[PDB]
Design a protein around this ligand. Structure first.
Ligand SMILES: [Mg+2]
Ligand SMILES: [Mg+2]
Ligand SMILES: [Mg+2]
Ligand SMILES: [Mg+2]
Lengths: 184, 185
C-alpha cells in the first residue's frame, strides 16, 4: 500500500522528538515504518556544506533540491513500494518556507523545479509544529518562514495539520495519533 | 557592458586549450579578460558531489544548476558589469547536451530551472568543438550528447559556431578569432 507523512516547522519545534514518537506508535501497532530526514537523506554531503557555507538563495534551493531528488528515488519511493509508512522530517515545504517566503524566491518557480525532483510525490498528511521563533538570518527572517508555513497550511487544509508546538510533547503526540488513526 | 563567451563540446575535444588561447588573443590587444569554468566556478565542492555513484540525472542537473547559479551571480555578472570579456569553459548547454539529450531529461524543464539560475544570461557566442563520440557511460551515451550539441547549434545558428575539433589547434584558434573580430573594434 504505502503511506507518506511529513513533519514541518522551525528548528527547535520538537520535530525529531515527534518523528521518533510517531514511529514508535506505529511500531507498537505492528505497522512497518521508515524514519528519514532532509537535508542529508539523499546526498549526505549537501547537509555538511550547507552547514559551513552561505550561498545565494537560488543555489541553496537547487542543492536542497538535488538532495531531495536522490532522497525521493533512493529512500522514500522504495520504502513506500514495500508498503512502509515513510516519515520524513522536512520535505518540500521547508524549501518553500525557508528559501521561498524567507529568502524571497518565487514560489511558482520553486514548485516548477520540485515537479521532476520529487517525481510528483507529496505526503498524505503533513504535521506543522507551529510556534514563534522565540519559543524555539535574524528574528525577522524566522518570522517570515513561520508565517510562510502558516500560509502554506491555509492553502492545503486537507494535507496540513497545524499543532501548537509549545504544548507538552505527550499531548502533541496524542494529537498526531488522533489525526492519523482514520488513515490506517 | 562586457562580452560573454562560452566553449562547449565533448571531453577531449580541446576546449580548455582554446579557452586559454582565446584569453591570450584578447589580452594581447588590451581587452581585460576573466577566464572561468563549470563545474566548479560557482561552488568548487560540486565537482566532488557530481561524481556520486548512480546519481539520478535529475539530481545531477540540480547540482550543475546550483553551481551555475552561484557562478553567474558571484563571478560572471560582476565580471561583465566591470566591462570584462568573460569566457566560460562549459555553461548551460553542457547540461542540455549531457543531462538532456544524453541522460534523457526533458529540455523545457531544464530551461525553466535555468531561467532563474542564470537570470536569463546567455553567451553572445558559443564555440562548439565537435568531436567524434568514440574519441571522448558507453559510446551510445556520448553519441546522443554529440548529436544533442549539434541539435542545439542548429536551433540557435547565430549563437553557436560549430568547429571541427580534429583540426590542428592553431587552425581552430584562428577560426575562433575570425568570428570574434566583428564583435570588438
Ligand atoms: Mg525541490
Ligand atoms: Mg510555523
Ligand atoms: Mg541550470
Ligand atoms: Mg554554452
Amino acid at each position: 500500500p504505502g503511506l507518506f507523512l511529513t513533519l514541518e516547522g522551525l528548528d527547535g519545534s520538537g520535530k525529531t522528538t515527534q518523528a521518533r514518537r510517531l514511529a514508535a506508535f506505529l511500531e507498537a501497532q505492528g505497522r512497518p515504518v521508515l524514519l528519514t530526514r532532509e537535508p542529508g537523506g539523499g546526498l549526505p554531503e549537501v547537509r555538511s556544506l550547507l552547514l559551513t557555507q552561505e550561498l545565494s538563495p537560488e543555489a541553496e534551493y537547487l542543492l536542497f533540491s538535488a538532495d531531495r531528488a536522490e532522497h525521493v528515488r533512493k529512500v522514500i519511493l522504495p520504502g513506500l513500494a514495500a508498503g512502509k509508512v515513510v516519515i520524513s522530517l522536512r520535505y518540500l515545504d521547508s524549501s518553500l518556507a525557508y528559501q521561498g517566503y524567507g529568502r524571497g524566491l518565487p514560489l511558482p518557480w520553486l514548485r516548477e523545479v520540485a515537479r521532476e525532483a520529487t517525481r510528483g510525490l507529496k505526503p498524505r498528511l503533513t504535521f506543522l509544529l507551529d510556534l514563534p521563533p522565540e519559543a524555539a538570518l535574524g528574528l525577522e527572517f524566522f518570522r517570515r518562514v513561520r508565517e510562510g508555513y502558516l500560509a502554506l497550511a491555509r492553502a492545503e487544509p486537507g494535507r496540513f495539520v497545524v499543532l501548537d508546538a509549545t504544548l507538552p510533547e505527550e499531548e502533541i503526540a496524542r494529537a498526531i495519533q488522533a489525526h492519523l488513526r482514520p488513515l490506517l
